[PDB]
Amino acid sequence: ASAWPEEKNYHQPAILNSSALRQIAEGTSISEMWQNDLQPLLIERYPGSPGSYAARQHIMQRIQRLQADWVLEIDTFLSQTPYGYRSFSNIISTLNPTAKRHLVLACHYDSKYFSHWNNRVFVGATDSAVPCAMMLELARALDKKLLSLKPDLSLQLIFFDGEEAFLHWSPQDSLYGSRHLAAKMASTPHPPGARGTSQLHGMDLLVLLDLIGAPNPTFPNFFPNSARWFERLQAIEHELHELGLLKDHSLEGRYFQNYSYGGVIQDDHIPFLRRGVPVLHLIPSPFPEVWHTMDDNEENLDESTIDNLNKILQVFVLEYLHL
Amino acid sequence: ASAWPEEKNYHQPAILNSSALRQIAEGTSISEMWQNDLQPLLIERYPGSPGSYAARQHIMQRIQRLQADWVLEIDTFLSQTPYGYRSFSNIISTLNPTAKRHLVLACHYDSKYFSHWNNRVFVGATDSAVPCAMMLELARALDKKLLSLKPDLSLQLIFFDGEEAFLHWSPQDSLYGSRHLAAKMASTPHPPGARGTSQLHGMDLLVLLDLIGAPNPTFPNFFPNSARWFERLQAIEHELHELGLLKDHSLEGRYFQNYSYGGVIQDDHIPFLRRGVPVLHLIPSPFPEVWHTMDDNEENLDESTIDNLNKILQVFVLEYLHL
Amino acid sequence: ASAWPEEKNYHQPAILNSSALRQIAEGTSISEMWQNDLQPLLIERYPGSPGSYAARQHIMQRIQRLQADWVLEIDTFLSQTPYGYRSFSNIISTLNPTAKRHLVLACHYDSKYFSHWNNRVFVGATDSAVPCAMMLELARALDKKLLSLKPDLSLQLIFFDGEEAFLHWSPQDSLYGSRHLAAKMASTPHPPGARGTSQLHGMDLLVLLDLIGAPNPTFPNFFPNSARWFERLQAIEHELHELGLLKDHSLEGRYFQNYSYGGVIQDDHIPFLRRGVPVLHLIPSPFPEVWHTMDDNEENLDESTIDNLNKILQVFVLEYLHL
Amino acid sequence: ASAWPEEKNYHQPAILNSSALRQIAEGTSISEMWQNDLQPLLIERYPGSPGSYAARQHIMQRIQRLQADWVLEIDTFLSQTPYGYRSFSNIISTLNPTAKRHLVLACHYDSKYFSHWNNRVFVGATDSAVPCAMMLELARALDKKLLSLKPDLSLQLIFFDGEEAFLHWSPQDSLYGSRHLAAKMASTPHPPGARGTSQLHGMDLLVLLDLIGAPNPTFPNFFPNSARWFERLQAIEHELHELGLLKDHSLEGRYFQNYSYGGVIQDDHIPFLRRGVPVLHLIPSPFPEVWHTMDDNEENLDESTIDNLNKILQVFVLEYLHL
Amino acid sequence: ASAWPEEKNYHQPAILNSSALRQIAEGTSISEMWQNDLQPLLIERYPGSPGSYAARQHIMQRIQRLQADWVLEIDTFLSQTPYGYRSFSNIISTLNPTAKRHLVLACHYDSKYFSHWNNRVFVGATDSAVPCAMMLELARALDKKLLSLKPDLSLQLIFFDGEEAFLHWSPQDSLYGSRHLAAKMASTPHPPGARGTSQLHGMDLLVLLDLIGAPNPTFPNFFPNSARWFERLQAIEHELHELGLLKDHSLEGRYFQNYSYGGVIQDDHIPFLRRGVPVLHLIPSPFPEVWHTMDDNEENLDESTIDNLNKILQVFVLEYLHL
Ligand SMILES: CC(=O)N1CC[C@@H](Oc2cccc3c2/C(=C/c2ccc4[nH]cnc4c2)C(=O)N3)C1
Ligand SMILES: CC(=O)N1CC[C@@H](Oc2cccc3c2/C(=C/c2ccc4[nH]cnc4c2)C(=O)N3)C1
Ligand SMILES: CC(=O)N1CC[C@@H](Oc2cccc3c2/C(=C/c2ccc4[nH]cnc4c2)C(=O)N3)C1
Ligand SMILES: CC(=O)N1CC[C@@H](Oc2cccc3c2/C(=C/c2ccc4[nH]cnc4c2)C(=O)N3)C1
Ligand SMILES: CC(=O)N1CC[C@@H](Oc2cccc3c2/C(=C/c2ccc4[nH]cnc4c2)C(=O)N3)C1
Ligand SMILES: CC(=O)N1CC[C@@H](Oc2cccc3c2/C(=C/c2ccc4[nH]cnc4c2)C(=O)N3)C1
Structure with a gap:
């Protein structure tokens, strides 16, 4: 168990400049996101359905066609549920x-x-297709900058499956994808041949996106081991603003407002948190008004707020990686 | 059973008049503390390190040297960890x-x-060297009125070992010391020979200090079985200020604000709280900014604040103990 | 990781010579042990009642009066049961x-x-009065041979409390005493000051006696890590017979029969097995007839078998201890 | 607490003389059982199937026509399974x-x-349609005597649903009906209005029949708390054969041989045994050659064996109840 | 669900003729096992030792040079132990x-x-160096016959790692390598694409070889869904004797004898058994003398007992696989 798993604790960002930041804002397109990356996913897609495979497919296509060398794996597994053994697949x-x-x-x-019901279908526009698209669009925008990876640090995306409960929300029936993936990653030497260090050691920080796409989001600072990273999103939000690069956005309505949160949301991060992974949980409090209703559709999304979180997160992420 | 173990539920304090408040203030020296109590605790001191031992025996010499008849105990024990079985010594x-x-x-x-890291070492000034000292200095400062114990009620201190995770925060890897001592008290009769009542029945209240020493702390009222004692920590801070006995202190920066908390903090009280011991958790929210970084050093401790908290705590203990 | 613990898997007895075997046979007096070692125990002695103390006392009085330097410890403790918390005291x-x-x-x-019932009072002469006696006597007998001890190893007795169940044999209501103590020793550095060796690594072997004193008994060989000590006991029952030291004893009616068993019996050894100690369980299969019936008394004990084990024992010991 | 829950270990059988033993043998018809109680049960009858329904009703019509005052009770319940929730009904x-x-x-x-498989259906003739019919037959054979039940002791028959696994014998896929009803009685005050005693304390003994019907069975002795009672079946087996009332039976090929067993058999007793119930577990070791094969049909039964067991059992039972 | 998971209750062997039974017995070489399959492996090879790697290396090499199209999977995982986190690798x-x-x-x-200890190093000869060799020979003896495999059924060999506890046998310390793969398998759908079936379904029977090399082993029949398959061992054994193709072989001391065992030995099957797999636990009972003692070496092995089992075994496998 060397010392590399503690570098996370001293990692510091490579703050960008107004000129770079300008390049970053102009290099992301919320409309190409909307059509190419997000509209394909707005379909029924619970675990094991045909939706799950269409969307699983859409995702890999969008990643497979980019220059950076993305090593996609599919992590199909089996688990009991209240309706019996079903088959999930994480990307x-x-x-x-x-x-x-x-x-x-x-x-x-x-x-x-x-x-x-009344012949409509739940499709989770904010829970969590926009998040999926955000991520996909972030690899698409930052592609050329992400070739530069040929500090020993790189980037992983994860698209979990079975996050949601099948019937009735509880530990036995939720977060099927993650830990799984947690427990699997916890028990897989890293780097290879390592001997005491798991892939979780190597997880510097886990940015979980969830419930994004409604208007007027407020993200809290949930955890102390990541507060500094949350503060970098505050600073990025503020700068992209002062340079004029956010859209219909005022500071009296920031997204990243410093406000500690009492309790904990259960979400896919809990399998990694209770293994000492640092989590930046970008889930808004309060949830959207359209949470878990058939109105979590596209009509009710805010394109401005997503373009904005996209700029911020793309920036966050290149500064993290010193790119 | 008996009726003695409900007495905690009715205990009123013996509230001090202005004149004693001033003596108590006069009677604790933050400069003494800093030099004689705290500075020696500012070393690398994890479980089973030499620091640990250094730190451990020091505590005891500061209590040994006082005139009250304190009864030290080292409840040393062994426990499994992410790096093997190791050894731990409560006090x-x-x-x-x-x-x-x-x-x-x-x-x-x-x-x-x-x-x-960069030749730097983690010493934990807030976490929890200062609270260790504050407790020492409480006993120095209060020695003479403590001697008055030759309501069947007296005073205990506990310096837990192993609170901190070795690898990654988790109910398996944390709170070693208290989980041990909690079970061991749940399992010890008291007073000797009693047949249905344990040491934990005679913990009237557990006052836990943690992460103290930084500028501008704010302490929530975490539990209701202990709220009324928080209200006393509030009426004490008030009166000591309204008397000019606190330093660099304004009421628009109270330490104890009547804000209740949502979630819960894992700390060395958990094992006593789910066993029915009343807790006054004096941990601030938010945490110090320097928490679990190398900057949690002496340079970054607010001496004015600590001195103010020393006085509040010393008063509390006396009005509880009817001294 | 020193290696003191593995010595127990290399320990070979100082097999005795027939001459010696005679003496030992002559040294234990089934009528003294009946006289005083045990008839005091034949009382109503469930944990907590008057009987329990008396018996506690009796046990001590009798070890105290031997010239070997026996260190006694009461380990009183508290635990939850189906009638409430109650107090127990190992020895x-x-x-x-x-x-x-x-x-x-x-x-x-x-x-x-x-x-x-009827006006009869249980007493458990086989469960476990006799086993107590048999241990006392073993002391009163080999006393002079023990004194030798001022490879380093010595002999500890233990007389668990509340093994029996207050209501229903259920893991929650049984073995109060061993369950406790195995946790306790499983967390106690041994020797003083050790950093990774608990008092259980110090148990070379555990010989537990239970349900002894009824006629014609058989003792299976349940545990591989301890056969070889079983074997030693076949031989020590063999030789001692073929030299006529054994009263009323035929080799078709052996005690330590070739006869592996399959399942486990729940007894005070479970806490110490689980954690991986070695055990020689001298409980018979089947149980005595009078089992948990008011007929478990003296009436029903066969002076001859007891003495005849009481002897195979006192040997086996001495052979363990190279004495 | 009260004293009556302890009656079960002092309770003695009223032995039957040689003439009363005839009157029991002469009192059951293996052919009335075969045709009227057992052949109706030799259908596919997994839980929820149409056979489960047909069986339930047969068992209740057979018991309804008897003169003695039976109270029937369908305790229908829901329980998760490897295919989702499915209903079960115990009788x-x-x-x-x-x-x-x-x-x-x-x-x-x-x-x-x-x-x-092969256009073949599993009907489980030993598993356990024959035990079912044994219990209806006794109910009949012994009616007039049971009708005497207008010590405080009576008799209950219980037919479990879903004993077997749906997919894989595993703690969570098996014993649906007895894990349930156990748990239920464990928490039903009995007698009514009581305050510390559960329907399960009322269980003097649970005689569980299982896997009966093949030829040449051997039943081991499983539980020291019930060996006295397994001895009483050995005796009955002996006497009935001494008197000539058992057919095709050699005291060589006895059924109740006193060879104790080691490990456990999972079956509808586990729920009741681990909650401290005394159990007589009549299940052969080894299991019929035809076990969980399509060949476990009526062709491979043995009429003489069942009739002999029918006569033992009825006797035991009557002796138990003093009739 | 499908039907093939059931195909296992119905499988029967393609029994071999006396002429064929001769070829096999000649087709094995007990010596070109010893010098080329077994000797390489008698080395200190606890998990992670440079022996482990050699062993793992050796095994692979040997299977790799065979004609059949074997697919090796090295499944290196990480797990917690009483010395910390170590890196296992199943074959x-x-x-x-x-x-x-x-x-x-x-x-x-x-x-x-x-x-x-005293300069001697534990290589485990019967635990389980020999077993692996048996397995390796077996695939070198039948190699030609296995090529036949380009009813849908073939062969898999698993050499676990981490069977052995590191300190003191226990749930949490033991079977590192099979607990882990059991679960890895219970959650991998099989065959690819499936929706409700786990690779453990596809496990027809698990034959576990453990503790094989002493002379005069007595393998019991532990489990009944395998008993039928145990009896195929008796009949192969018997038969190969009636033509004395064996050696030093009696019938007064055959290996597989009609002697059920009481309970269970903990070994690498538990994890599979408790998910309802079928096990042929070819572990003798009692264990060898040289068990967990440094004399489990090449000098207390019985060349002849092994060449025989090697023949019994090898046959059985052809009869299972209709070759
Ligand atoms: C304030 C808040 O929002 N939360 C939720 C997370 C939890 O705290 C942690 C989160 C992540 C890593 C952590 C800890 C954590 C908690 C903690 C509590 C009391 C402490 N006293 C001294 N160091 C101490 C450390 C720790 O040790 N490592 C409290
Ligand atoms: C507004 C707020 O602050 N909270 C705390 C957690 C959440 O808890 C719930 C309470 C009751 C029923 C629930 C859930 C809940 C939580 C949840 C958490 C994260 C999600 N991401 C997508 N759907 C997700 C669902 C769910 O699915 N069903 C609401
Ligand atoms: C509001 C809040 O912030 N919290 C956190 C602590 C928790 O409550 C307790 C803390 C300490 C001792 C306690 C209880 C507590 C809680 C409780 C909750 C609901 C109740 N309804 C009626 N009595 C009731 C008692 C209780 O009974 N004993 C509620
Ligand atoms: C399958 C098997 O081998 N067993 C052991 C006996 C039986 O255990 C019981 C079952 C039901 C009620 C029981 C007990 C039981 C067992 C027991 C074990 C050790 C004892 N030492 C002294 N009395 C003692 C009592 C007891 O006290 N009450 C299961
Ligand atoms: C050590 C020993 O003697 N054992 C191991 C467990 C036990 O039985 C099994 C072993 C492996 C798989 C099994 C079952 C098993 C047992 C069982 C018991 C009672 C039954 N009554 C009707 N079908 C019934 C099925 C079952 O359904 N699947 C025998
Ligand atoms: C089945 C049973 O009743 N028992 C009682 C003792 C226990 O065996 C042990 C006791 C202490 C330390 C131990 C082991 C033990 C047992 C065991 C079982 C299968 C084995 N195969 C190879 N070594 C193997 C070792 C082991 O590996 N380390 C088995």
């Missing part, structure tokens, strides 16, 4: 799997099982 | 071991474990 | 506490509780 | 339910789910 | 991975970690 996409340290972005790509 | 110092009831104050004397 | 007797390693002979000194 | 037949104590005879009436 | 040799069902043979290729 992991790694740059430099051999890099010892990674920064991770993660969301969930299942949609909650619901029966149809 | 307990009681007045009147047979006194049925006891006001207990506690903190933690270990330091998290960190590799050395 | 540990050691020579050379420091004697890093140890051979341990355990039995249980309580009596199951029962109401008074 | 409980009870004499004098106020009666505080009860000897309890039980089997299972489901069949294991299989998929047709 | 998984398979024919026709797709082969939905598989008959599996398995042993454990680790050696228990012992210090060095």
Whole structure:
């Protein structure tokens, strides 16, 4: 158990400049996101459905066609549920799997099982297709900058499956994808041949996106081992603003407002947190008004707020990686 | 059973008049403390390190040298960890071991474990060297009125070991010391020969200090079985200020604000709280900015604040103990 | 990682010579042990009642009066049961506490509780009065041979409390005493100051006696890590017979029969097995006839078999201890 | 607490003389059982199937036509399974339910789910349709005597649903009906209005029949708390053969041989045994050659064996109840 | 669900003729085993020792040079131990991975970690160096016959790691390598693409070889869904004797004898058994004399007992696989 797993604790960012930041804002397109990356996912897609495979497919296509060398794996597994053994599949996409340290972005790509009602279907526009698209669009924008990876640090995306409960929310029935992936990663030497260090050691920070796409989001600072990273998002939000690069956005309505949170949301991060992974949980409090209703559709998304979180996060992420 | 162990539920304090308030203030020296109590604790001191031992025996010499008849104990023990079985030594110092009831104050004397970075070392000034000292200095400062214990009630201190995770925070890898001492008290009869009542029945209240020493702390009222004692820590801070006995202090920066908390903090009280001991958790929210970084050093400690908290705590203990 | 613990897997007895075997046979007096070692125990002695103390006392009075330097310990403690919390008191007797390693002979000194039926009172002469006696006597016998101890190893007795169950044999309501103590020793550095060796690594072997004193008994060989000590006991029952020291004893009616068993029996050894100590369980299969019936008394004990084990024992010991 | 829950270990059988033993043998018809109680049960009857329903009703019509005052009780419940929730229905037949104590005879009436193989259906003839019919036959053979039940003791028959696994014998896929009903009685005050005693304290003994029907069975002795009672079946087996009342039976090929066993057999007793119930577990070791094969049909039964066991059992039972 | 998971209750062997039974017995070489399959492996090889790697290296090399199209999987995982986190590596040799069902043979290729005592090093000869060799020979003896495999069924060999506890046998310390793969398998759908079936379904029977090399072993029949398959061992044994193709072989001391065991030995099957797999636990009972003692070496092995089992075994496998 060397010392590299503690570098995370001293990692510091490579702050960008007004000129770079300008380049970053102009290099992301919320409309190409909307059509190419997000509209394909707005379909029923609970675990094991045909939706799950169409969306699982859409995702890999969008990643497969970019220049950076993304090592997609599919992590199909079996688990009991209240309706019996079902088959889930997580999507992991790694740059430099051999890099010892990674920064991770993660969301969930299942949609909650619901029966149809008045012939509408639940599709989870904010829970969590926008997150999925955000991530996909971030690899698409930052592609040329992400070739530069050929500090030992790289980037992983993760699209978890079975996040949502099948029937009735509880530890036995939720977060099926993650730990799984947690427990699996916890028990896989890293780097290879390592002897005491798991892939979780190498997880520098896990940025979980969830419930994004409604208007007027407020993200809290949930955890102390990541507060400094949360503060970098505050600073980025503020700068992109002062340079004029955010859209319909005022500071009296920031997204990253410093406000500690009492309790804990259960979400895919809990399997990695209770293994001492640092988590930046970008889930808003309060949830959207359209949470878990058939109105979590596209009509009710805010394109401005997503373009904005996209700029911020893209920036966050290149400064993390010293790119 | 008996009726003695509900007495905690009715205990009123013996409130001090202005004139004693001024003596108590006069009577604690933050400069003494800093030099004689705290500075020696500012070393790398994790469980089973030499620092640990250094730190451990020092505590005891500061209690040994006082005139009150404190009864040290080293409850040394062994426990499994992510790096093997290791050894841990609590420290307990009681007045009147047979006194049925006891006001207990506690903190933690270990330091998290960190590799050395840029030749820098983690010493944990807030976490929890200062609270260790504050407790020493309380007993120095109060020695003479404590001697008055030759309501069957006396005073206990506890310096827990192993609070901190070795690798990654988790109910398996944390709170070693208290989880041990909690079970061991749940399992010890008291007073000797009683047949249905344990030491934990005679913890009237557990006052736990943690992460104290930084500028501008704010302490929530975490529990309701202990709220009314928080209200007393509030009426004490008030009156000591309204009398010009606090330094660099304004009421628009109170330490104890009547804000309740949502979630919960894992700390060395958990094992006593889910066993029905009342807790006054004096941990601030938010945490110090320097928490679990190398900057948690002496340079970054607010001496004015600590001195102010020394006075509040010393008053509290006396009005509880009817001294 | 020193290696003191593995010595127990290399330890070979100082097999005795027939001459010696005679003496030992002549040294134990089934009518003294009946006289005083045991008839005091034949009382109603469930944990907590008057009987329990008396018996506790009796046990001590009798070890105290032997010239070997026996260190006694009461380990009183509290635990939850189906009638509430109640108080229990183990009994540990050691020579050379420091004697890093140890051979341990355990039995249980309580009596199951029962109401008074017909006007009869349970007493558990086989469960486990006799095993107690048999250990006392073993002391009173080999006394002079023990004194030798001022490879380093010595002999500890143990007389667990509340093995029996207050209501329903259920893991929650049984073995109060061993369950406790195995946790306790499983967390106690041994020797003083060790950093990774608990008092259980110091148990070379545990010999537990239970349900002894009824006629024609058989003792299976349940545990591989301890056969070889079983074997030693076949031989020590063999030789001693073929030399006529054994009264009323035929080799078709052996005690230590070739006869592996399959399942486990739940007894005070479970706490110490789980954690990986070696055990020689001398409980018979099947149980005595009078089992948990008011007929478990003296009436029904066969003076001859007892003495005839009481002897195979006192040997086996001495052969363990190279004495 | 009260004293009556302890009656079960002092309770003695009223032995039957040579003439009463005839009157029991002469009192059951293996052919009336075969045709009227057992052939109706030789259908596919996994839980929820149409056979489960047909069986339930047969068992209740057979018991309804008897003169004695049976109380039937369909305790229908829901429980997770490897295919989702499925309903199960246990059948409980009870004499004098106020009666505080009860000897309890039980089997299972489901069949294991299989998929047709060779155009063959599993009907489980030993597993356990024959035990079911044994209990209806006794109910009949012994009616007039049971009708005497207008010590405080009576009898109950219990037919479990879903004993067997749906997919893989595993703690969570098995014993659906007895894990349930155990748990239920464990928490039903009995007698009514009581305050510390559960229906399970009323279980004097649980005689569980299972896997009966093949030829040449050997039943081992499983539980020291019931060996006295397994001895009483050995005796009955002996006497009935001494008197000529058993057919095709050699004291060589006895059924109740006193060869104790080692490990446990998972079956509808586990739920009741681990909650401290005394159990007589009539299940052969080894298991019929035809076990969980399609060949476990009526062709490979043995009429003489069942009739011989029918006569033992009825006798034991009657002796238990003093009739 | 499908039907093939059931195909295992219905499988029967392709029994061999006396003429064929002769070829096999000649087709094995007990010597070109010893010098080329077994000697390489008698080395300190506790998990992670440079022996482990050699062993793992050796095994692979040997299977690799065979004609059959075996697919080796090294499944290196990480797990917690009483010395911290160590890196295990299971060996998984398979024919026709797709082969939905598989008959599996398995042993454990680790050696228990012992210090060095009087300069002697524990190589475990019967535990389980020999087993692996048996398995390796077996695939060198039948290689030609296995090629036949390009009813849907083939062969898999599993050499576990980490069977042996590191300190003191216990749930948490033991079977590192099979606990882990059992679960890895219970959650991998099989065959690819499946929706509700786990690679453990595809496990027809697990034959576990453990503790094989002493003279005069007595293998009991532990489990009944395998008993039928145990009886195929008796009949092969018997038969190969009636033509004395064996050696030093009696019938007064055959290996597989009609003597059920009581309970269970903990070994690498538990993890599979408790998910309802079928096990042929070819572990003798009682264990060898040289068990967990430094004399489990090449000098207390019985060349002849092994060449025989090697023949019994090898046959059985052809009869299972209709070759
Ligand atoms: C304030 C808040 O929002 N939360 C939720 C997370 C939890 O704290 C942690 C989160 C991540 C890593 C952590 C800890 C944590 C908690 C903690 C609590 C008390 C402490 N006293 C001294 N160091 C101490 C450390 C620790 O040791 N490592 C409290
Ligand atoms: C507004 C707020 O602050 N909170 C705390 C957690 C959450 O808890 C719930 C409470 C009751 C029923 C629930 C859930 C809940 C939580 C949840 C958390 C994260 C999610 N991401 C996508 N769907 C997700 C669902 C869920 O699915 N069903 C609400
Ligand atoms: C509001 C809040 O912030 N919290 C956190 C602590 C928790 O409550 C307790 C803390 C300490 C001792 C306690 C209880 C507590 C809680 C409780 C909750 C609901 C109740 N309804 C009626 N009595 C009731 C009692 C209780 O009974 N004993 C509620
Ligand atoms: C399958 C098997 O081998 N066993 C052991 C006996 C039986 O255990 C019981 C079952 C039901 C009620 C029981 C007990 C039981 C066992 C027991 C074990 C050790 C004892 N030492 C002294 N009395 C003692 C009593 C007891 O006290 N009450 C299961
Ligand atoms: C050590 C020993 O004697 N054992 C091991 C467990 C036990 O039985 C099994 C072993 C492996 C798989 C099994 C079952 C098993 C047992 C069982 C017991 C009672 C039954 N009554 C009807 N079908 C019934 C099925 C079952 O369904 N699947 C025998
Ligand atoms: C089945 C049973 O009743 N028992 C009682 C003792 C226990 O065996 C042990 C006791 C102490 C330390 C031990 C082991 C033990 C047992 C065991 C079982 C299978 C084995 N195969 C190879 N070594 C193997 C070792 C082991 O590996 N380390 C087995």
